[PDB]
Amino acid sequence: QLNPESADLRALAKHLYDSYIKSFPLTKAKARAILTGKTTDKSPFVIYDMNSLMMGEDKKEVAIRIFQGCQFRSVEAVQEITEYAKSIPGFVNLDLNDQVTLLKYGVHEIIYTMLASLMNKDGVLISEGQGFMTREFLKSLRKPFGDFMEPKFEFAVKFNALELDDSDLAIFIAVIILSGDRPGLLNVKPIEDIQDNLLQALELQLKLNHPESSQLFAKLLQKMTDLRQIVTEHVQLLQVIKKTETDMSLHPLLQEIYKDLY
């Protein structure tokens, strides 16, 4: 069982982990430490209703501008993911257009993966760990905004119940990136070859790290389907917004909070 093959897989998982640590300053361990109250400098003010919303400020056209905002403030994560992708063995040898294609679909799914780290069943970290926006407060907001985040919380609750750590996620994320079924890929075989190696490394990682979790490997792969669904659901969200017929001054702080989400 421990042989050159498995040792290569461990070396790959270690390589991915180190590069993930180097690429992503926002790790799951860091998010979990904030959420469980252990980070003195990131004690997130809990925003749970309109009253606390007002106290929180220290610092539809509304919807599209939420999306313009958050999609602009994701540039740093996209650059981090891109840096990480460059460290995946084989990725930079792929056709450049395929690299771009892999990243342009992968980043949204990876952002949601890392968004889950900021989430628990009660809410989501915002403003770099200085705010904690509650799930139920978000859900209570007027249509269409009240429905923005709830399916992400639903995904995150289920994803976090897998108890993956950053060692797991680094490979998981690599597997996401090397998805040979992205539309418009020119050479699918060299991508699938890397992903198969990544999937082998992931499978081993999960055996070594998760003795409790029956079919964790399969359940994790199923989460890639849930991730695609969330991204897909945003397309449908744009349509709901096209034929949205309401005016309401969504509190500007709430618009700012939403720009901190995805």
Binding site: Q79, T82, K86, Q99, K104, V107
Partner: peptide, 13 residues
């Protein structure tokens, strides 16, 4: 292509 594709290409290079 989109702005995102342009951000990625820049980061890749």
């Amino acid at each position: 292509n989109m702005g995102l594709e342009a951000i990625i290409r820049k980061a890749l290079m």
